[PDB]
Amino acid sequence: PLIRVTLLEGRSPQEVAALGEALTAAAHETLGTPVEAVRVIVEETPPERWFVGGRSVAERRAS
Amino acid sequence: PLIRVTLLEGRSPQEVAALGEALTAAAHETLGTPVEAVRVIVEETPPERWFVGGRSVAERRASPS
Amino acid sequence: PLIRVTLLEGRSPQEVAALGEALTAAAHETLGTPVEAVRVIVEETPPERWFVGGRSVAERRASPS
Amino acid sequence: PLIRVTLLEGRSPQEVAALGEALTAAAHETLGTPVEAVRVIVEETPPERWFVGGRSVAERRAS
Amino acid sequence: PLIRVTLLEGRSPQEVAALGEALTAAAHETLGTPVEAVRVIVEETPPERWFVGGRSVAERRASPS
Amino acid sequence: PLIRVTLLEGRSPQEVAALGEALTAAAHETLGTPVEAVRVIVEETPPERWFVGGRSVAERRAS
């Protein structure tokens, strides 16, 4: 199973490593997939490049 | 955050619903993100359109021994 | 540039055609890119395969009150 | 509605912010989606990593 | 590595199988990656959902002269 | 035809340029697509952000 998670920049090394373990466990538990068959990519996006309601997360945090 | 999952066709509806919930719990506990801020999109690919080693999952299934 | 849109199933053909045009005009005006250099791909997801808060759009629709 | 735009690196901060506003307006106008329901990610790609006709945009600009 | 291809609908099964193999050989020779480490996912888009210049491939096909 | 290749960071400039040429040739050969109609994006992912079996490629290399 392939999993891509896109989230905001600024996460700790712990958080990214934890996320990759935990998403893998979730797929293994719910689908029966061997853990080695679960592949995860974490993509981090700067807050100036993520918009909700037409305003960036960087602006929404400021305003 | 956005979680996009690519799976082979043929999982049951109950397994897909359980996966959505469990991936969401995993992002909640590890990142602190509220569950309502986590989105999951599950895409299913037919086995003729997924290749490993240059051969489709369908072809690899037809010769596994 | 490439614009990939993910939408729930059920939009009309006319709305999808109008979206493609309008996203293209938006990229043209803001970036200067010629319209012919903008590509848009629209993907439709069934509501059983889109989750928010760990529950599918289908499940959230079945209990909205 | 979720929108991912991939474009070449080197855009100004104005251009990215403008793009996120304008794509959001387009989705709101054409689908009736509340602006808060439109989410946009802008991904920027270095010109050495985008190919057309088997040559990078960086090479095509040089040559 | 992961190779995701987006194609218009309508290619034959034989062409899609040949593409998967050939993209895999290309990644093997240029990167050194073993073939079994290369995955290819082929996605097909209907021509009403692919836009260039703000018009769908279907619309551009209906007026090409 | 559009092709996105995600692979690990650390590739040489030769390797990325070669990959973009070779993937383009493969699409041209197998589909009959004019080379100018083949578009390729190469995305590079740090090894700490790619997981197999719940462990990052960075950890798997160390351990």
F1-63 placed in CATH 3.30.429.10: yes
Query: Which candidate, D57, C24, F27, D44, places its Cα nearest to that of E7?
Result: F27
Q: Which of B17, B35, B43 sits opposite C56 (nearest CB)?
A: B17
Q: Which helix (H) or strand (E) holds D7?
A: strand D2-8
CB contact under 8 A, D16 and A53: no
**Chain A closest-CA separation from residue F16 CA (Å):** 20
- Interatomic CA distance for residues E46 and F4, integer angstroms: 19
- Helix %, strand %, coil % for chain D, to 5? 50, 30, 20
Query: Residue E42: CB partners within 8 Å, gap ≥ 6?
Result: B49, B50, B51, E5, E7, E16, E19, E20
Residue count of chain A = 63
CB contact under 8 A, D6 and C2: yes
Instruction: State yes or no: is F46 an active-site residue.
Output: no
Long-range contacts: F12-21, Cβ < 8 Å, 24+? Answer: F13/D48, F15/E30, F15/E31, F16/D48, F16/D49, F16/F42, F17/D48, F17/D56, F17/D59, F18/E30, F19/E26, F19/E27, F19/E30, F19/E31, F20/D49, F20/D51, F20/D54, F20/D55, F20/D56, F21/D51, F21/D54, F21/D55
Domain at E1-65: CATH architecture: 2-Layer Sandwich (3.30)
How far apart, in Å, are the Cα atoms of B21 and each of A37, B36, B60, D15?
Answer: 20, 11, 31, 37
CB contact under 8 A, C24 and E54: yes
Q: Domain residue spans in chain E?
A: 1-65
Pick the residue of E7, E21, E29, E44 with the most B CBs within 10 A to test the interface with B by mutation: E21
CB contact under 8 A, F19 and E27: yes
What chain A residue is nearest to B40 in terms of C-alpha separation? A5
Method: X-ray
Q: Which residues of E touch C39 (CB under 8 A)?
A: 50-52
Q: Which residues of C touch F2 (CB under 8 A)?
A: 2, 39, 41
Helix spans in chain C (H): 13-31, 57-62
